[PDB]
Design a binder for this molecule. Structure first.
Ligand SMILES: O=C(O)c1c(Cl)ccc(Cl)c1O
Ligand SMILES: O=C(O)c1c(Cl)ccc(Cl)c1O
Ligand SMILES: O=C(O)c1c(Cl)ccc(Cl)c1O
Ligand code: FES
Ligand code: FES
Ligand code: FES
Ligand SMILES: [Co+2]
Ligand SMILES: [Co+2]
Ligand SMILES: [Co+2]
Ligand SMILES: [Co+2]
Ligand SMILES: [Co+2]
Ligand SMILES: [Co+2]
Ligand SMILES: [Co+2]
Ligand SMILES: [Co+2]
Lengths: 342, 342, 341
């Protein structure tokens, strides 16, 4: 296949998307059949029947077993063929289908598409806020026609806020930014404190009313490959970013093909937990910003890749590209390390 | 090199599809202009004008001659340029267009897309029942986005009936009771007799007799490349076979591209010959079996070919795959034999 | 792909440009075309130097095209005139490629190749389009065929007898008199349809006047793919040198190897104040060009794979002289350029 970092955990779906009716979805050019078994456990099988290659995702569950819609072979969550209705009903090993390591955690469905012997659920990113009773989480799914790295670049960058999300987050006090970049093992963080300018649209609706040279906060954490969690906050007194009013944003990308990807987004609130109106506001921003703004930009950039590559054009970095560049380099190393292993 | 067996007869159309208005259709990646001349004889020309390559199929007949819609060159059924309206009206040999051997027989339009010197109308499969006054034939055409071999596999197989054609073709009285596969020269037959009695709703209404147990038959014949004729029958007591209530089903495939094909189907009844109403029902059930059922499965499988090939995945055969496997091997040989020739 | 990059091509009609950028691809090169506040047209590579966003999706800010992604601003020459980030430094690496552009004869010409070779002496003459003595109407069409197929089409005005049958058929066809004049960077194909019944279309040009007449359908080709035809019809043996006519603009600009832009127009010498005659011409352009010719060339493009896979070559007729010579000139230009770099 192309260049993907297969040895890592990726989100394949949101829990609400799975049920007894299989979901067919492609991850890193690998077609998967994702479904929840009767015992509530999620299973992930290669969406290719071992017999004649029909999509198992088009089948239904029979006694908790996924049945191939073509000739009826039945499989368990581990991919073992548990029933062959033909002939003497023999089930040779050649009839088992490939099963992928899968972990449901933090209201996310994680999958390991690479070497199964190398998985290890302990390396899965921490998105605990998504199931923390102290937070209220709302979110969704989006499909985007761009290489996932373009969206990683996007999420790791604050600059476009002023233009891409013009109508929304356009701080007239964005000329006085400050951004710290922390590098760790398979982890990078861009932290920013913002003490100035009475909001505009976004934070406004999140807020109520305040003013002082020290309030806002905008941060983002990146974990190995393409899983990010941001931190959007605002508060009164010289109180730490803690005790503040904030939303931790889930922004996770999973490559589908070399030129397309899956986008799992969400907002985990610390305020208005029982307020349905805020839920709307948040979902209204996600649909606007992430689906009606960032998508348009990255999809247009993807359409220009052929030209940039055909010619020897390289990007010209600005002062605000530090975080994105470092993440980009880490992802590159991971690709090389894996290619070397091969 | 998409790999087609060019030296063989293929159905390019049903008689009802042809008239004085040319039909443009691609067979084995070869664009053809098919039309019936004023004398009623069908002609098949390469759909590429010798002059500047315009589609002759977009032209009209002028005095029984197909006129190119671009600059007016006129051709006869043999591809000879019979009129050049330009200059001195000279007609050099370079102006003739390629003509394909074509035979209208058994209410089918047969064409030889390969080496014309090797044709021979005598090798054409026998589908006499289609024009036998003792039978009533109804049928149609269907386009499918799958390599033709996937549909050949399908037609040569009885095991998916229960799941794909779920009920209409379902029969718990089908089980698995000895399927005889006879291999000939350019012909293969899969014979299956089911002593138990379970006649379709249509044929049962003809058993009459005087209350008697009945046997049933589900046979199919395959001829060189991809032309099949099945035998669905039922009869009482000492069930002979040729004196039973039956339908001979025409199921012929013709490759369009490497990943698409033409499907010509039909039913030749031996019962209810004077039931125009029954005509619509039988054609509708075949259309349903193709469009809403077999098509969905084979097109999904075609969508998985890239992955299976990129990886080294081979199919895992079951007890019920004997007939399909043998036909598949015969087609393979034919490809090799032809590849060896040139 | 094989394109002759060192030549002027029409990238748009003036009416298509404004302060809102137009994104259009020419010879596989994405362009951002727009008219600055001073009225001057600019043509920039539609790829921001920073992170490659389409500048054509941006808006003008103080006469400067602003990238919609992170706000870099550029002038008509591609110079980055404003960087809102950091210390606002503007290193040379931030400038975007600008293409030589000339607005002339109600056409927007662009040089997509080596900018140092842009030789304006080569911009074709289409003066009739802005000559107050003529009335011009026209439009744009996108076609899914290699541009050379449409060049062949336009250089064979004879196809009108069949392709444009319902409007161009003539009974005096077998009496045609065609000649081919070759010259320095220019080729002309002349056609004369002697004293015959005016064609349906020529009838309209003559407000329904079915009386013996002489017809003319000439065409001029200039370096690469810019053509201007001459459709005239006049009584008995009157001279065409001074007749009722229409000079047809037929210019093609490759988009990709298998697609192109078609800029067409009609510059009348009659019924200048007759809007119904405008409709007659627009109708013809919509039917014949955007439909009739398109249907034919698009079908031919669909057969290229087969013809090439096999070793099929076209069989030329007596009426192919002009098209063949133009085809050979274009070939030479490709070779000359391939030889250069
Ligand atoms: O989608 C988010 O997590 C988000 C929100 Cl809720 C508010 C503001 C910004 Cl700049 C965001 O990126
Ligand atoms: O499609 C057919 O030829 C057919 C018919 Cl008409 C009746 C019953 C069965 Cl089981 C068939 O496979
Ligand atoms: O659009 C044109 O220039 C044209 C007209 Cl008006 C009449 C006939 C032909 Cl063949 C043309 O190409
Ligand atoms: S393809 Fe799955 S049982 Fe046959
Ligand atoms: S392409 Fe057929 S006559 Fe010219
Ligand atoms: S991509 Fe244009 S300013 Fe960033
Ligand atoms: Co079980
Ligand atoms: Co069983
Ligand atoms: Co079986
Ligand atoms: Co954004
Ligand atoms: Co004849
Ligand atoms: Co079937
Ligand atoms: Co300025
Ligand atoms: Co034309």
């Amino acid at each position: 296949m192309a260049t993907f970092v297969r040895n890592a955990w990726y989100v394949a779906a949101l829990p609400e998307e799975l049920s007894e009716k299989p979901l067919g979805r492609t991850i890193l050019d690998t077609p998967l059949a994702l479904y929840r078994q009767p015992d509530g456990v999620v299973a992930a099988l290669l969406d290719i029947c071992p017999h004649r290659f029909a999509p198992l995702s088009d089948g239904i569950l029979v006694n908790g077993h996924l049945q191939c819609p073509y000739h009826g072979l039945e499989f368990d969550g581990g991919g073992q063929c548990v029933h062959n209705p033909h002939g003497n009903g023999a089930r040779p090993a050649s009839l088992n289908v490939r099963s992928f390591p899968v972990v449901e955690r933090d209201a996310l469905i994680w999958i390991w598409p690479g070497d199964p012997a190398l998985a290890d659920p302990g390396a899965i990113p921490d998105f605990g806020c998504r199931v923390d009773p102290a937070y209220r989480t709302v979110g969704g799914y989006g499909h985007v026609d761009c290489n996932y790295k373009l969206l990683v670049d996007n999420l790791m960058d604050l600059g476009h806020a002023q233009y891409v999300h013009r109508a929304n987050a356009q701080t007239d006090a964005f000329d006085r930014l400050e951004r710290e970049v922390i590098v760790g093992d398979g982890e990078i963080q861009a932290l920013m404190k913002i003490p100035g300018g009475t909001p505009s649209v976004l934070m406004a609706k999140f807020l109520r009313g305040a003013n002082t040279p020290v309030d806002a906060w905008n941060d983002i954490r990146w974990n190995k490959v393409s899983a990010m969690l941001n931190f959007i906050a605002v508060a009164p007194e010289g109180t730490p970013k803690e005790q503040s009013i904030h939303s931790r944003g889930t922004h996770i990308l999973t490559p589908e093909t070399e030129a397309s990807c899956h986008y799992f987004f969400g907002s985990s609130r610390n305020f208005g937990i029982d307020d349905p109106e805020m839920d709307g506001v948040l979902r209204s921003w996600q649909a606007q910003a992430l689906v009606k703004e960032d998508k348009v930009v990255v999809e247009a950039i993807e359409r220009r890749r052929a030209y940039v590559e055909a010619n020897g054009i390289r990007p010209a970095m600005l002062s605000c590209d530090e975080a994105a560049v470092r993440v980009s380099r880490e992802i590159e190393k991971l690709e090389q390390l894996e290619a070397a292993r091969l």
